[PDB]
Structure 1
Amino acid sequence: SEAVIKVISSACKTYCGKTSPSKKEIGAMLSLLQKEGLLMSPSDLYSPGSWDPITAALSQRAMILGKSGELKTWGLVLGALKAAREE
């Protein structure tokens, strides 16, 4: 995607600051969400209810395969979006 990623970058850096995820991480993780059939479009990230299955799926593959690559990026984006949705 293009716009969706930029929207996240300007948002996460407002909460996490310098501890925010890199654009390269977001862009790569987004494709993972689609390939896994978790989300149809990157814009689906605006749905807070859909965060539950995604987070669960990520933690599952992380504890089973031993890879938290997408989990690390998701955790940051999730936290930023969660805080934003709380306001």
Structure 2
Amino acid sequence: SEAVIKVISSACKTYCGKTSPSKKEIGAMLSLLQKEGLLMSPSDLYSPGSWDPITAALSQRAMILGKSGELKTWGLVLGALKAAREE
């Protein structure tokens, strides 16, 4: 909502670098992950067991509707966490 965005911003800067998402991107993606009912809180990102219903949906709306405005953010925020929960 304001802090979590920074907790993941500094994280993706070590697992992605300059390619990492911005503060304005994640912030927008979050609001969408809360409106779609896919998430109840911004801390839900700490649940690697919910990335399934959150990855298929985003990839479903993008492939269908024809827009991955939120996917580009999810994939990035995920590519980092996925590595943080592997070590």
In the superposition, the TM-score normalised over structure 2's length comes to: 0.98
Give, in angstroms, the shift of residue 3 of structure 1: 1.1
Q: Number of aligned pairs?
A: 87
- Of Structure 1 and Structure 2, which has the larger fraction of its residues in helix? 1
Superposed CA deviations along residues 21-47 of structure 1, whole A, max 9, x for unmatched, are 011000000000000000000100000
Unaligned runs of 5+ in 1: none
Which position in structure 1 is the counterpart of 2:39?
A: 39
Structure 1 runs of 4+ aligned residues shifted over 6 Å read none
1:64 deviation in Å? 0.5
1:20, CA displacement in angstroms? 0.1
Identity of aligned residues (%): 100
RMSD of equivalent CA atoms: 0.4
Distance 1:52 1:22 in 2: 23
Relative to the length of structure 1, the TM-score reads: 0.98
Cα deviation 1:66-86 (Å, max 9, x = unaligned): 010100011010000000100
Q: Which runs of 5+ in 2 are unaligned?
A: none
Partner of 1:30: 30
